């Protein structure tokens, strides 16, 4: 419970000093981990807010630009929605290992083939060319924003796990060791007193025996 | 030099006489012949392990950890045969070398020595295993008196400023080296890489010396500056701007 | 005596003790961060420290290849394991900041036969093999090492 | 392997990202999107969301901010680390941070 | 002796000792991770061990109900607490193979009155209640558990 | 003794110890969530605790002005720092839930001179300056700060 209960000996005092240096080193290494994670975590949070601020205005411009296509190209939306096969843009999952933890992120990739190339050839194609470009720009900010989200959530869990270990070291492991080391130093000194008293009483009996042995000469 | 040898298998009481004999000679050289003297004692632990025998010979009951309780006085009666004195040039300086039993500073031999002596210097098993010779660790070391050994007139005006900044950069360097091992090199700042490059060059040029290379204080400070020059002038925060203006240039 | 009979051994002795100490620091931190924080130099350091620990400092009390190991065998084994360290470390440091960097994983692939040979060096038998034969085989490992590192450089 | 983004949203938003190149069919002929017509029930939205977060090909899901507030129960109940979800504005609909389930966690936010 | 007069007891003693041991094993982890990460079987183990600790091991000898506690009361309490444990564990293990998974919290929120009845068993008093009356109350609690667990399946 | 000779000082001493204890408690919140996250009362508490720590409790005895510090000088210094604290705290708390609200930055903008004087009072010299001059400068800083806060609220 409150102590490790290694039996009092100079060995155990050495082992408990070593365990204390071990636990204190572990605390310091994990404190550096927690600080580095905390810095990145707060950086990512600011990037999330900023990326959402960027996304809103681009999305409003794109959403209004569709009305210009709807003015000249008619209900082109039905042909677009009905005719689907393969994407022109896709993503790949990727990792960082900073501060000893895996953070998932995404990158944007482009596949060349425009599955809507001829849309509005007859009329409205000027507006539809602006329209595709506006949403095609928006997607890359979404892929980045999603990467910030997954990173932020993963960093939050990693900080909690790290701080649990740091505080378990600081409030469980180190206190068991320091209370044990106090018990070891105490009982080691109790054995030293019990030895001292025996050696002193022996020395007094010897002095009595010497004095008696000299008296026996009379 | 005057050299006294007491072998491990010489009489234990001659091991007790040997410091008292050496200091009696050092008092003659210093306080009567006006010499400056440096008295080196090579293992006080072997002296404590002798005083224990003479104590057991008188049938005295052992004190703490089996050594005689009065060791503080006997050890003081050795070590305090030191210092400069009124109206004389002579002065006994002393370096009692001391093998910490079980590597432990809490042991009574180092503990009493730390109470009597003005400071301590540590040999370190880590530096020794790294083959850094001499393996003196600067961080737990402290020359208690150093502020009156150094500066203008006594050595050079920069010395304390250099030593403080070197100590700080080695301490921060050790902390950043531990940080690199946790976070990886990509997470280090440019300033972290300076404290880490300083740390590598410091152990290889400042602490490392080899057994027969002799360095003056002056040459040591110029090596100190060759290392401190690694940093930007503004990063050397403990040094005064006058000392930087006189000595940061190389 | 080493400067008279074995001039290479003092560099090897120091490099060995250094590698074996760097292992203690690295083998501590990896308990809390795994491999992720290790530099390529540190991966190389742990690999050579494991080679030295498992295949040079390790020795069987009861089998003819290990029952006694003469100094000619002993220096030859360590010379190879630390020559690997210097060359592997050089390959990384030479390709750091380039468009493509040599990693420990690239090394572990291209040096796989050399690593098998390095661990096998301990089985050469001073009874059934002459010391000149063991030295010639160990020299062939150094030549094989050079030609395997030349695949990367 | 690669992944794709997927969409739950109104006809205009879906049409926009489809011309932005987002649209693909899985080998089972199922699209990577739902056009939420006004007649669509919450069960179709939530089922599509649960399909998209559990699917192997989809890496990211985009949800119109108003639809994200309709499906809010499943959207907040989704707590996997890898498959990301984004609440996005639209012309007749709310702003980019309305009730945002990620932003509401942060201590360092203003 | 138990095999002649209390044939049910040796299994119950064994399971009770094991449950208390498993909670003390789990506690060493909880003290560095919190109450949340444990599997539902282990949550059941921890909560049941807390019921065994607080409503069986504890006995307030300065109060009439705990002044004395005959063996028939003692074994009856064990039979109920262990019947709860086996059925609670079984209910999870039977259903965790599916989306229809029973959990410690589902059990707790469906069976709060049975948990209250379980904790109350210490208050039965041989000075006022006959042996058959205490036994009949405990038999009713066993039947209540069985029908409540059958209502989770 | 203080009741007879320094009757206001026991209040000031008590307030000082509280402000310093509050600095250590508030420093945990600053380390958790930054100075920006604190209440206005707590921000001004850190500013006054900084004045107390930096210019009341510190005393460089090598300087001619701090060779010694009489008890009247010591009381006058602390009286002004805590008078500023009470007036700033009243201004903040009086504007709590208002449209226009007092904060440390407003105080530093409109009366940063009083913050400068509260530090500067350490330089007054009982050898060069008469007691009346010293006491009068302290009384003038009390009037100056009272007028300065009165211009805000």
């Amino acid at each position: 419970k409150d102590r490790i209960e290694i039996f009092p000996s100079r060995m155990a005092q050495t082992i408990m000093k070593a365990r204390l240096k071990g636990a204190q080193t572990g605390r310091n290494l994990l404190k550096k981990k927690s600080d580095a994670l905390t810095l990145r975590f707060r950086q990512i949070l600011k990037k999330i807010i900023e990326t959402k601020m960027l996304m809103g205005e681009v999305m409003r411009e794109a959403a209004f630009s569709l009305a210009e296509a709807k003015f000249t190209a008619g209900d082109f939306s039905t042909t677009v929605i009905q005719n689907v096969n393969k994407a022109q843009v896709k993503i790949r999952a990727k990792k960082d290992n900073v501060a000893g933890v895996t953070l998932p992120v995404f990158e944007h990739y482009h596949e060349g083939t425009d599955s809507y190339e001829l849309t509005g050839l007859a009329r409205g194609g000027e507006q539809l060319a602006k329209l595709k470009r506006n949403y095609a720009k928006a997607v890359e900010l979404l892929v980045e924003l999603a990467s910030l989200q997954t990173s932020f959530v993963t960093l939050d869990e990693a900080i909690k796990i790290t701080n649990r270990r740091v505080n378990a070291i600081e409030h469980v492991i180190i206190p068991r060791i320091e209370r044990t080391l106090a018990y070891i130093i105490t009982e080691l000194d109790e054995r030293e007193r019990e030895e001292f008293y025996r050696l002193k009483k022996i020395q007094e009996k010897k002095k009595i025996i010497k004095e008696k042995s000299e008296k026996d000469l009379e | 030099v005057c050299l006294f040898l007491n072998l491990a298998n010489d009489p234990t009481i001659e091991r007790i006489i040997t410091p008292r004999l050496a200091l009696t000679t050092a008092e003659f050289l210093a306080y009567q012949c006006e010499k400056h003297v440096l008295v080196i004692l090579t293992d006080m632990s072997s002296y404590a392990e002798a005083l224990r025998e003479v104590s057991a010979a008188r049938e005295e009951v052992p004190g703490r950890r089996g050594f005689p309780g009065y060791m503080y006085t006997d050890l003081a009666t050795i070590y305090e045969r030191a210092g400069r004195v009124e109206g004389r040039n002579g002065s006994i300086t002393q370096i009692p070398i001391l093998t910490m039993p079980n590597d432990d500073i809490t042991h009574p031999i180092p503990d009493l020595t730390g109470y009597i002596t003005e400071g301590q210097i540590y040999v370190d098993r880590q530096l020794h295993n790294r083959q850094i010779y001499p393996p003196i660790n600067v961080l737990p070391s402290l020359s208690r008196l150093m502020k009156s050994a150094i500066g203008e007139g006594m050595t050079r005006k920069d010395h304390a400023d250099v030593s403080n900044q070197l100590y700080a950069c080695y301490a921060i360097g050790k902390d950043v080296q531990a940080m690199k091992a946790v976070v990886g090199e990509e997470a280090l700042t440019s300033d972290d890489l300076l404290y880490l490059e300083f740390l590598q060059k410091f152990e290889k040029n400042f602490i490392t010396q080899g057994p027969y290379e002799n360095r003056t204080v002056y040459e040591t400070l110029d090596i100190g500056w060759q290392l401190l020059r690694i940093f930007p002038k503004e990063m050397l925060k403990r040094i005064p701007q006058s000392t930087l203006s006189e000595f940061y240039p190389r | 005596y080493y400067d008279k009979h074995f001039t290479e051994f003092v560099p090897l002795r120091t490099k060995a003790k250094e590698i074996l100490q760097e292992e203690e620091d690295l083998a501590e931190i990896v308990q809390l961060v795994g491999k992720a924080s290790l530099a390529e130099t540190d991966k190389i350091t742990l690999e050579v420290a494991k080679l030295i620990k498992d295949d040079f400092l390790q020795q069987n009390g009861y089998t003819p290849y290990d029952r006694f190991c003469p100094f000619y065998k002993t220096v030859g084994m360590l010379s190879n394991m630390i020559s690997f360290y210097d060359m592997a470390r050089r390959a990384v440091e030479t390709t750091a900041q380039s468009d493509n960097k040599i990693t420990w994983s690239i090394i572990r692939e291209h040096m796989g036969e050399i690593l098998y040979k390095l661990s096998s060096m301990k089985f050469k038998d001073p009874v059934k093999d002459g010391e000149a034969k063991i030295k010639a085989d160990y020299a062939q490992l150094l030549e094989d090492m050079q030609n395997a590192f030349r695949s990367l450089e | 392997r690669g992944k794709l983004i997927a969409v739950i949203g109104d006809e205009d938003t879906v049409t926009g990202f489809l011309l932005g190149g987002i649209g693909e069919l899985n080998k089972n002929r199922h699209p990577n999107f739902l056009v939420v017509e006004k007649d669509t029930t919450i069960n179709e939205i939530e089922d599509t969301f649960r399909q998209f977060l559990n699917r192997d090909d989809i890496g990211i899901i985009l949800i119109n901010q108003y639809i994200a507030e309709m499906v809010r129960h499943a959207l907040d109940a989704h707590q996997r680390s890898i498959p990301a979800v984004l609440e996005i504005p639209s012309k007749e609909h709310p702003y980019d941070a309305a009730k945002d389930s990620i932003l509401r966690r942060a201590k360092g936010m203003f």
Side-chain angles (χ1 to χ4, degrees), chain A residues 142-164:
Chain A
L142 301 179
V143 179
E144 178 166 31
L145 181 58
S147 302
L148 297 172
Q149 174 180 110
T150 56
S151 180
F152 174 85
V153 174
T154 305
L155 285 168
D156 189 38
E157 293 193 326
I159 288 169
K160 284 186 169 187
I161 291 161
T162 301
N163 289 0
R164 290 174 187 165

PDB file of all heavy atoms in Angstrom, chain A residues 142-164:
ATOM      1  N   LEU A 142     -10.754  21.699 -46.916  1.00  0.00           N
ATOM      2  CA  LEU A 142     -11.456  20.668 -46.151  1.00  0.00           C
ATOM      3  C   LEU A 142     -10.510  19.526 -45.761  1.00  0.00           C
ATOM      4  O   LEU A 142     -10.503  19.107 -44.607  1.00  0.00           O
ATOM      5  CB  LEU A 142     -12.670  20.139 -46.935  1.00  0.00           C
ATOM      6  CG  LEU A 142     -13.724  21.191 -47.311  1.00  0.00           C
ATOM      7  CD1 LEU A 142     -14.855  20.531 -48.092  1.00  0.00           C
ATOM      8  CD2 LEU A 142     -14.335  21.879 -46.096  1.00  0.00           C
ATOM      9  N   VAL A 143      -9.673  19.044 -46.681  1.00  0.00           N
ATOM     10  CA  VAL A 143      -8.709  17.963 -46.395  1.00  0.00           C
ATOM     11  C   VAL A 143      -7.720  18.376 -45.304  1.00  0.00           C
ATOM     12  O   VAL A 143      -7.418  17.615 -44.377  1.00  0.00           O
ATOM     13  CB  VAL A 143      -7.949  17.546 -47.668  1.00  0.00           C
ATOM     14  CG1 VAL A 143      -6.926  16.441 -47.377  1.00  0.00           C
ATOM     15  CG2 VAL A 143      -8.917  17.006 -48.724  1.00  0.00           C
ATOM     16  N   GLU A 144      -7.234  19.613 -45.378  1.00  0.00           N
ATOM     17  CA  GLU A 144      -6.395  20.188 -44.335  1.00  0.00           C
ATOM     18  C   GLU A 144      -7.150  20.292 -43.001  1.00  0.00           C
ATOM     19  O   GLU A 144      -6.665  19.823 -41.973  1.00  0.00           O
ATOM     20  CB  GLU A 144      -5.876  21.545 -44.823  1.00  0.00           C
ATOM     21  CG  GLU A 144      -5.018  22.250 -43.771  1.00  0.00           C
ATOM     22  CD  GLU A 144      -4.217  23.430 -44.345  1.00  0.00           C
ATOM     23  OE1 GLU A 144      -4.670  24.086 -45.308  1.00  0.00           O
ATOM     24  OE2 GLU A 144      -3.116  23.710 -43.822  1.00  0.00           O
ATOM     25  N   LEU A 145      -8.368  20.834 -43.010  1.00  0.00           N
ATOM     26  CA  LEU A 145      -9.178  20.997 -41.806  1.00  0.00           C
ATOM     27  C   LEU A 145      -9.451  19.662 -41.110  1.00  0.00           C
ATOM     28  O   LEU A 145      -9.289  19.546 -39.897  1.00  0.00           O
ATOM     29  CB  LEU A 145     -10.492  21.694 -42.191  1.00  0.00           C
ATOM     30  CG  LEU A 145     -11.445  21.950 -41.015  1.00  0.00           C
ATOM     31  CD1 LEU A 145     -10.822  22.799 -39.907  1.00  0.00           C
ATOM     32  CD2 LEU A 145     -12.682  22.680 -41.529  1.00  0.00           C
ATOM     33  N   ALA A 146      -9.813  18.639 -41.878  1.00  0.00           N
ATOM     34  CA  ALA A 146      -9.993  17.290 -41.368  1.00  0.00           C
ATOM     35  C   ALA A 146      -8.703  16.760 -40.723  1.00  0.00           C
ATOM     36  O   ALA A 146      -8.744  16.175 -39.644  1.00  0.00           O
ATOM     37  CB  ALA A 146     -10.432  16.403 -42.534  1.00  0.00           C
ATOM     38  N   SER A 147      -7.545  17.014 -41.331  1.00  0.00           N
ATOM     39  CA  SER A 147      -6.263  16.622 -40.740  1.00  0.00           C
ATOM     40  C   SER A 147      -5.993  17.315 -39.411  1.00  0.00           C
ATOM     41  O   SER A 147      -5.494  16.701 -38.468  1.00  0.00           O
ATOM     42  CB  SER A 147      -5.116  16.966 -41.682  1.00  0.00           C
ATOM     43  OG  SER A 147      -5.309  16.317 -42.910  1.00  0.00           O
ATOM     44  N   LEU A 148      -6.331  18.601 -39.305  1.00  0.00           N
ATOM     45  CA  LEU A 148      -6.203  19.312 -38.039  1.00  0.00           C
ATOM     46  C   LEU A 148      -7.132  18.702 -36.982  1.00  0.00           C
ATOM     47  O   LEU A 148      -6.691  18.477 -35.860  1.00  0.00           O
ATOM     48  CB  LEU A 148      -6.482  20.804 -38.235  1.00  0.00           C
ATOM     49  CG  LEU A 148      -5.511  21.547 -39.160  1.00  0.00           C
ATOM     50  CD1 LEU A 148      -6.038  22.957 -39.408  1.00  0.00           C
ATOM     51  CD2 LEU A 148      -4.117  21.662 -38.549  1.00  0.00           C
ATOM     52  N   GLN A 149      -8.378  18.369 -37.339  1.00  0.00           N
ATOM     53  CA  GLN A 149      -9.333  17.717 -36.436  1.00  0.00           C
ATOM     54  C   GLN A 149      -8.771  16.412 -35.865  1.00  0.00           C
ATOM     55  O   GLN A 149      -8.713  16.243 -34.649  1.00  0.00           O
ATOM     56  CB  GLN A 149     -10.666  17.484 -37.176  1.00  0.00           C
ATOM     57  CG  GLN A 149     -11.710  16.683 -36.380  1.00  0.00           C
ATOM     58  CD  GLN A 149     -12.993  16.488 -37.184  1.00  0.00           C
ATOM     59  OE1 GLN A 149     -13.331  15.396 -37.622  1.00  0.00           O
ATOM     60  NE2 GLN A 149     -13.727  17.541 -37.451  1.00  0.00           N
ATOM     61  N   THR A 150      -8.328  15.489 -36.716  1.00  0.00           N
ATOM     62  CA  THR A 150      -7.820  14.192 -36.249  1.00  0.00           C
ATOM     63  C   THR A 150      -6.568  14.354 -35.398  1.00  0.00           C
ATOM     64  O   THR A 150      -6.434  13.700 -34.361  1.00  0.00           O
ATOM     65  CB  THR A 150      -7.504  13.270 -37.428  1.00  0.00           C
ATOM     66  OG1 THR A 150      -6.591  13.892 -38.302  1.00  0.00           O
ATOM     67  CG2 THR A 150      -8.755  12.931 -38.230  1.00  0.00           C
ATOM     68  N   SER A 151      -5.677  15.264 -35.790  1.00  0.00           N
ATOM     69  CA  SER A 151      -4.490  15.595 -35.016  1.00  0.00           C
ATOM     70  C   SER A 151      -4.859  16.132 -33.633  1.00  0.00           C
ATOM     71  O   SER A 151      -4.448  15.564 -32.626  1.00  0.00           O
ATOM     72  CB  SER A 151      -3.645  16.591 -35.802  1.00  0.00           C
ATOM     73  OG  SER A 151      -2.493  16.912 -35.055  1.00  0.00           O
ATOM     74  N   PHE A 152      -5.724  17.144 -33.564  1.00  0.00           N
ATOM     75  CA  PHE A 152      -6.192  17.750 -32.319  1.00  0.00           C
ATOM     76  C   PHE A 152      -6.795  16.725 -31.364  1.00  0.00           C
ATOM     77  O   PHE A 152      -6.400  16.658 -30.203  1.00  0.00           O
ATOM     78  CB  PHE A 152      -7.226  18.820 -32.667  1.00  0.00           C
ATOM     79  CG  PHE A 152      -7.921  19.443 -31.478  1.00  0.00           C
ATOM     80  CD1 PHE A 152      -7.337  20.518 -30.789  1.00  0.00           C
ATOM     81  CD2 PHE A 152      -9.154  18.919 -31.042  1.00  0.00           C
ATOM     82  CE1 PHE A 152      -7.985  21.063 -29.666  1.00  0.00           C
ATOM     83  CE2 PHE A 152      -9.803  19.472 -29.925  1.00  0.00           C
ATOM     84  CZ  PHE A 152      -9.219  20.545 -29.236  1.00  0.00           C
ATOM     85  N   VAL A 153      -7.709  15.885 -31.849  1.00  0.00           N
ATOM     86  CA  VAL A 153      -8.348  14.869 -31.009  1.00  0.00           C
ATOM     87  C   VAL A 153      -7.315  13.863 -30.503  1.00  0.00           C
ATOM     88  O   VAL A 153      -7.321  13.489 -29.333  1.00  0.00           O
ATOM     89  CB  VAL A 153      -9.482  14.160 -31.767  1.00  0.00           C
ATOM     90  CG1 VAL A 153     -10.076  13.000 -30.962  1.00  0.00           C
ATOM     91  CG2 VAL A 153     -10.622  15.140 -32.059  1.00  0.00           C
ATOM     92  N   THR A 154      -6.382  13.444 -31.356  1.00  0.00           N
ATOM     93  CA  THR A 154      -5.358  12.478 -30.954  1.00  0.00           C
ATOM     94  C   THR A 154      -4.387  13.064 -29.935  1.00  0.00           C
ATOM     95  O   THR A 154      -4.049  12.407 -28.955  1.00  0.00           O
ATOM     96  CB  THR A 154      -4.595  11.984 -32.175  1.00  0.00           C
ATOM     97  OG1 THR A 154      -5.519  11.474 -33.103  1.00  0.00           O
ATOM     98  CG2 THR A 154      -3.616  10.870 -31.828  1.00  0.00           C
ATOM     99  N   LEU A 155      -3.965  14.313 -30.122  1.00  0.00           N
ATOM    100  CA  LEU A 155      -3.140  15.033 -29.160  1.00  0.00           C
ATOM    101  C   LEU A 155      -3.843  15.189 -27.814  1.00  0.00           C
ATOM    102  O   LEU A 155      -3.196  15.005 -26.791  1.00  0.00           O
ATOM    103  CB  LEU A 155      -2.778  16.412 -29.720  1.00  0.00           C
ATOM    104  CG  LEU A 155      -1.701  16.374 -30.808  1.00  0.00           C
ATOM    105  CD1 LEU A 155      -1.611  17.719 -31.515  1.00  0.00           C
ATOM    106  CD2 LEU A 155      -0.331  16.081 -30.204  1.00  0.00           C
ATOM    107  N   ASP A 156      -5.142  15.474 -27.788  1.00  0.00           N
ATOM    108  CA  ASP A 156      -5.877  15.584 -26.525  1.00  0.00           C
ATOM    109  C   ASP A 156      -5.790  14.284 -25.710  1.00  0.00           C
ATOM    110  O   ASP A 156      -5.421  14.294 -24.536  1.00  0.00           O
ATOM    111  CB  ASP A 156      -7.342  15.941 -26.799  1.00  0.00           C
ATOM    112  CG  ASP A 156      -8.110  16.277 -25.517  1.00  0.00           C
ATOM    113  OD1 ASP A 156      -7.535  16.911 -24.607  1.00  0.00           O
ATOM    114  OD2 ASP A 156      -9.309  15.929 -25.436  1.00  0.00           O
ATOM    115  N   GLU A 157      -6.050  13.139 -26.346  1.00  0.00           N
ATOM    116  CA  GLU A 157      -5.919  11.840 -25.681  1.00  0.00           C
ATOM    117  C   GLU A 157      -4.479  11.569 -25.232  1.00  0.00           C
ATOM    118  O   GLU A 157      -4.249  11.154 -24.096  1.00  0.00           O
ATOM    119  CB  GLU A 157      -6.398  10.720 -26.607  1.00  0.00           C
ATOM    120  CG  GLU A 157      -7.908  10.802 -26.860  1.00  0.00           C
ATOM    121  CD  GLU A 157      -8.458   9.532 -27.523  1.00  0.00           C
ATOM    122  OE1 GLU A 157      -7.753   8.906 -28.345  1.00  0.00           O
ATOM    123  OE2 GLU A 157      -9.613   9.153 -27.220  1.00  0.00           O
ATOM    124  N   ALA A 158      -3.489  11.847 -26.080  1.00  0.00           N
ATOM    125  CA  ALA A 158      -2.089  11.633 -25.744  1.00  0.00           C
ATOM    126  C   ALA A 158      -1.633  12.507 -24.567  1.00  0.00           C
ATOM    127  O   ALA A 158      -0.900  12.027 -23.699  1.00  0.00           O
ATOM    128  CB  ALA A 158      -1.258  11.894 -26.999  1.00  0.00           C
ATOM    129  N   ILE A 159      -2.091  13.757 -24.484  1.00  0.00           N
ATOM    130  CA  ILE A 159      -1.821  14.629 -23.341  1.00  0.00           C
ATOM    131  C   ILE A 159      -2.447  14.041 -22.088  1.00  0.00           C
ATOM    132  O   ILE A 159      -1.739  13.893 -21.097  1.00  0.00           O
ATOM    133  CB  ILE A 159      -2.290  16.072 -23.596  1.00  0.00           C
ATOM    134  CG1 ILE A 159      -1.341  16.717 -24.619  1.00  0.00           C
ATOM    135  CG2 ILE A 159      -2.316  16.911 -22.307  1.00  0.00           C
ATOM    136  CD1 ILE A 159      -1.823  18.061 -25.169  1.00  0.00           C
ATOM    137  N   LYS A 160      -3.720  13.631 -22.116  1.00  0.00           N
ATOM    138  CA  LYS A 160      -4.355  13.011 -20.941  1.00  0.00           C
ATOM    139  C   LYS A 160      -3.592  11.771 -20.483  1.00  0.00           C
ATOM    140  O   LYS A 160      -3.226  11.689 -19.315  1.00  0.00           O
ATOM    141  CB  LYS A 160      -5.833  12.703 -21.224  1.00  0.00           C
ATOM    142  CG  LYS A 160      -6.678  13.983 -21.181  1.00  0.00           C
ATOM    143  CD  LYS A 160      -8.175  13.682 -21.325  1.00  0.00           C
ATOM    144  CE  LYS A 160      -8.965  14.953 -20.992  1.00  0.00           C
ATOM    145  NZ  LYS A 160     -10.429  14.711 -20.947  1.00  0.00           N
ATOM    146  N   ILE A 161      -3.244  10.861 -21.388  1.00  0.00           N
ATOM    147  CA  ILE A 161      -2.464   9.658 -21.058  1.00  0.00           C
ATOM    148  C   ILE A 161      -1.112  10.037 -20.448  1.00  0.00           C
ATOM    149  O   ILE A 161      -0.727   9.515 -19.406  1.00  0.00           O
ATOM    150  CB  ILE A 161      -2.303   8.782 -22.315  1.00  0.00           C
ATOM    151  CG1 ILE A 161      -3.669   8.183 -22.715  1.00  0.00           C
ATOM    152  CG2 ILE A 161      -1.273   7.660 -22.091  1.00  0.00           C
ATOM    153  CD1 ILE A 161      -3.712   7.690 -24.162  1.00  0.00           C
ATOM    154  N   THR A 162      -0.411  10.998 -21.041  1.00  0.00           N
ATOM    155  CA  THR A 162       0.886  11.438 -20.522  1.00  0.00           C
ATOM    156  C   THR A 162       0.745  12.070 -19.148  1.00  0.00           C
ATOM    157  O   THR A 162       1.468  11.688 -18.236  1.00  0.00           O
ATOM    158  CB  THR A 162       1.572  12.407 -21.481  1.00  0.00           C
ATOM    159  OG1 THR A 162       1.764  11.776 -22.722  1.00  0.00           O
ATOM    160  CG2 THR A 162       2.956  12.817 -20.997  1.00  0.00           C
ATOM    161  N   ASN A 163      -0.209  12.970 -18.940  1.00  0.00           N
ATOM    162  CA  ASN A 163      -0.409  13.615 -17.645  1.00  0.00           C
ATOM    163  C   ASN A 163      -0.842  12.627 -16.559  1.00  0.00           C
ATOM    164  O   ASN A 163      -0.368  12.742 -15.432  1.00  0.00           O
ATOM    165  CB  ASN A 163      -1.395  14.779 -17.789  1.00  0.00           C
ATOM    166  CG  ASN A 163      -0.807  15.962 -18.534  1.00  0.00           C
ATOM    167  OD1 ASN A 163       0.340  15.973 -18.965  1.00  0.00           O
ATOM    168  ND2 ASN A 163      -1.577  17.008 -18.696  1.00  0.00           N
ATOM    169  N   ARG A 164      -1.637  11.600 -16.886  1.00  0.00           N
ATOM    170  CA  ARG A 164      -1.928  10.504 -15.947  1.00  0.00           C
ATOM    171  C   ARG A 164      -0.639   9.818 -15.510  1.00  0.00           C
ATOM    172  O   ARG A 164      -0.398   9.726 -14.314  1.00  0.00           O
ATOM    173  CB  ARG A 164      -2.900   9.487 -16.554  1.00  0.00           C
ATOM    174  CG  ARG A 164      -4.318  10.051 -16.706  1.00  0.00           C
ATOM    175  CD  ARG A 164      -5.208   9.047 -17.441  1.00  0.00           C
ATOM    176  NE  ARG A 164      -6.527   9.624 -17.743  1.00  0.00           N
ATOM    177  CZ  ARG A 164      -7.417   9.151 -18.598  1.00  0.00           C
ATOM    178  NH1 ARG A 164      -7.235   8.049 -19.259  1.00  0.00           N
ATOM    179  NH2 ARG A 164      -8.518   9.797 -18.820  1.00  0.00           N
TER     180      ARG A 164
END
